[PDB]
């Protein structure tokens, strides 16, 4: 059959007759707005040749129609390549339709079904769309009048046609009247089962009367449903491109037209933007937004923005991507515009279209246009046309001569082509520069115009310039070298400074004055900022890891970090307090000092530290090493080493002395190297046949009694065990001393 | 420093005046 | 004698001969720079008539002179009204002088003496300046060759003249050869003692050949040394004023010339500032600084500032104080100038001097001058001359017509006198305004020029205007009422809003567009800020005074302060902890709640509170009363009442029970209403012949034993006293319970 | 509130678009 594009048939049924020879519609078919059609107009109107619709089918306001079983008897597959609001089948407001009648449709590859507001429409609840569409949750079929196989009730569409159901083994390939599955590449149905050439539709692609899963080279996929040779795509190109074996109408993003395959071309994609009759005036942000991404322009550009606000950033973002101009360039009546520097990629002007009077560049009524381009690094090329310069006081003959030399149009301009203003032709130099950590002194040679009265002072412009890719009034000097001093500069910062003189535009030839060159001056360094966030962790018994963040203000190139540490002595009150009573809630935690220089590092490790010993780590940053290091103030952090697990164990033989009156004197050797200090000693003694009894020996008690002295002890065999209580926790009980009294 | 030099040049070229014409200065004003 | 002004004699001695008839110099006398004079020129050169010098005497580079005993024999008083660097006598660099010789000088009323670098000068250490000057610490006499009364060494000046010393009783009035004191009004000396008419000089003032302490009316003091009539001062005025009976040359600050006494005239003092040949051009801040305080100008003003920076504040501060202009006014080539509004007091232009061509007001080359004056409240008067308006695009015919109508020069201007620009002639209105606490919606009727393409959008200007004494781009509407919304407005703030349309200046008659009127819109109020700094003090036992500061953000008119209070319960652990052991360090410190509404007040008082009871005062501010008060979040402060001084005293009869085995059971009644709670009870018991013994009863002990139970008590007579220890401190001991066992 | 009204007027006079031309809207586009 013949392949045809999509139609939008309305008003009259004559345009429908073009479907008589179409078997596949490469597009969408819409049928709408017939208020005169009657059922007598549709009795023998049929299009059995049509089978598959690529995009979608739409029916709207169709009067006189009652069923599609005659109009579209053999319509089988709706690919749904392009969807009408995610619908491949739209049946809206059918006043006279009584049934769908489409007894050959079996699969809708993409899209949903919307059947709404169709009065008199029946045989809808008997349609099983689940076997047609992979997902039917999006189907919107509401507000209607609503032998054959039965699915979860019988499925039917007409009084004579049942709903065909193929076996699950056949999948979506279809089945014949006998139920045998079609070919794996068959879609819809098959005149002969298991035959790719006999498929009424192709599941993946159609080529040479056959159904294939892909288009072999050199054939490329077309409309995601067929395969076409390169010749057809090329013919379509001349009133289409090739990319990934697809004859897509246009290349994707990031690709350029390589004379017929798309080729990557980085960001800037060479494209020919065709202007309406080759003429367009830019006056607003939205006007320039239409030129987004353009690189080659097939027309002339006229620039006239009647604004008043600095919109240079937006213009540079939108424009500046064009490299060649076919036509002429005109600039006129630009008030807010100050320069043409935002024309980033503007290099060549072909000038095929010229302004009247043989002009390629036109300039008029420029009230603020002082500079054209950075001719030191920007190059401009002009092919044809003459330059125009008139009524532009802000632009003087120096810039005009520079641009004429750059373009190469020296012997191309005649008379009258070229006719408060910063046009300092003369040059100034700086005589003496002195720098401080925050103060800068500048000195330049004095300048005197022929009429010294025209001089009205100087303008100094300063700004912080980290990169070299680039408002103070100074009184006129009295009638040697004028100078200035500034103090508001951050240390270790680069500032761009240029001085502009102030001259009076007299009635005669005004002395244009002298401009000083831009210079970059770096402020002197000083003491850096404090390194905050100091964390010191005892990752081991005697190992301390210290981490910190670099200071907020480097104030120069940081050379190193100066670290000090000092043993932190515990409170003396702990050596005199008694804890044997109730309330045993134990709180658990110039001179030269050992110093470290952390160089090219952000962490430090400290070893050889006593267990459970506090330390006051002091941190400073220094941006200087040999000459009297400039270091910030001290940053203090407390670090405590983890105590030993054995320092709390009592060692030494426990000695006991028995008096005549059953008085026991207990001598024990304390762990002379404890976990900081021992608050008290815990003793648990128990006679045979009795219960354990607890006792506490304080530091004062241990010092005065050299241990313990129990009095009034009953006869029997005792057991003596002593536990040393330190800050790290309870220690280990002594060996059981057994004595009989 | 820079402040004293800046003041000196200010009085040297702009004549704001670090020196005030004094008892002495009036004499060489007459000479 | 004759009175003469001051002389500055130099080069030649001829000009000295004018002193022959001068007895009093009303000024200073300077004698300098004679390189030809010789001692033979001074042998009989004398001026005995001269007596007193008002200001000072100066000798410099005097060649040939050796002594002043002949030149100035009778010079007696140096008043020092005007001082040469605080010196009334300057003797500098006398090469040939050998002695001062001024044997008649006796008092220098004001100033010091400087005798420096005078070679060959002797008889200096013998001069006593203390009797001459009140203070001699300022005398600078360095680097020189250096019968009579003796003062702390004899005082002399020449080989024949002694230093006259008058008795202390004579003070500075002088004394004759006999030592008798002169008259009380005499100064210097007196031919006849005690005679005002015979004084050689007057201490206070001189009048009619007599010395007086003040000038009686109508005579006024002149030069602080004499008295003159009003006729003399008036004659001096016509090539002087009267103020406080003083013929001062000029009136003091804050006074005006009342046609001949100065009269107060508030700040603006009417003064006639005479311009050099009646012409002056203002182009700089220092140029305008010369016109500070001027009110009436006798000349013409030309205004042309070739600057580029907004210096309107400085110009308004300096200028704007002038009310009348004798000459013409010209404005030309003003770039940075935007308006003439800073001419605060400029009302009348006399126009006596006119610009060539019969022009009083000239205007030319005004590149930014958009407005002249606020003609709604500012009035301008032009007497003569014609207006000029040319090459001023920023000023249009509307302002010109307004100023012509205001001045009253309608029928005074001929042809050619009057010839990107904000000149919106048409008016706009706002259609709908909606306000929120931070958001404002504006709506205005659409505007369409005859050429809608010329419209390029709208400009909205907003600023916070607390007083009515007074930058957003809006896209053009599509081809009903355009509107805008803003959200960055503080609550309860007034903002001034006016919308300006954007139109294109076409080649033909440009449509000037329409401007919208300024409006003031106040943002809606909201919940105010938190009232910080809450201080609550128990100024009494049950009185709490609460003070706070108003919230930082009122967010409306604050209606009242909402205050809540709640009893703060103490920690329960204090009711279970035992403190009888060592370590007696005592730490000393929906629902409806009682609320208060502080209205028109910043402090609150709370009564009826239990002693030593904590309270959590909650404070909020509300700018609303009836309709669902908008109150800020709670601010919490802790307040503790001062405890009672008697609640810690134990009351009730102390009971004791004696057992058979000398066991004592003590029952006491605790102060059921204590200062918060009682931590423990302190008991001190002492038998006769023994020492006091201490005991503690804890809360647990008191609860379990219902008091105390002492065991093992020796026979004798005991004394029982119990003290209750509360948070407020130690209580009062119980009555001494005496029992014999 | 003010946000919804501002959005409504923005789509009414500036045509940024609170409604997107939908399945329904295309039909009265044809009428």
Numbering used by the authors:
A (entry chain B), C (entry chain A): 5 to 150, 168 to 173, 179 to 265, 277 to 296, 299 to 458, 465 to 515, 531 to 539, 549 to 658, ...
B (entry chain C), D (entry chain D): 1 to 31
What is written in the article reporting this PDB entry?
Insulin binds and activates a receptor tyrosine kinase, the insulin receptor (IR), at the cell surface. The activated IR triggers signaling cascades to control many facets of physiology. A previously reported selective IR agonist without sequence homology to insulin, S597, activates IR and mimics insulin’s action on glycemic control. To elucidate the mechanism of IR activation by S597, we determine cryo-EM structures of the mouse IR/S597 complex.
To reveal the molecular mechanism that underlies S597-induced IR activation, we determined the cryo-EM structure of full-length IR in complex using the complete S597 sequence comprising both components-1 and −2 as well as the linker connecting these two components. The cryo-EM map of the IR/S597 complex was determined at 5.4 Å resolution, indicating the structural flexibility of this complex. In contrast to the IR/S597-component-2 complex, the structure of IR/S597 assumes an extended T-shaped symmetric conformation, bringing together the two membrane-proximal stalks. This structural feature suggests that IR bound with the full-length S597 represents the active ligand-receptor complex. Each S597, which adopts a helix-loop-helix fold, is embraced between two IR protomers at the top part of the extended T. The S597-component-1 contacts the L1 domain of one IR protomer, while the component-2 from the same S597 interacts with the FnIII-1 domain of the adjacent protomer. In this way, one S597 molecule simultaneously engages the two IR protomers, thereby stabilizing the active conformation of IR. The linker connecting the site-1 and site-2 components of IR that consist of six residues was not resolved in the cryo-EM map, reflecting its structural flexibility. Our structural comparisons reveal that the conformation of one protomer in this extended T-shaped IR closely resembles that of the protomer in the Λ-shaped apo-IR dimer. This structural analysis strongly suggests that, after the apo-state of IR is disrupted by the binding of S597-component-1 to the L1 domain of IR, the two protomers undergo a rigid-body rotation using the L2-FnIII-1 interface as a hinge, leading to the extended T-shaped IR. Indeed, we did not observe the α-CT motif in our structure of the IR/S597 complex, which suggests that once the α-CT is released from the L1 domain, it becomes disordered.
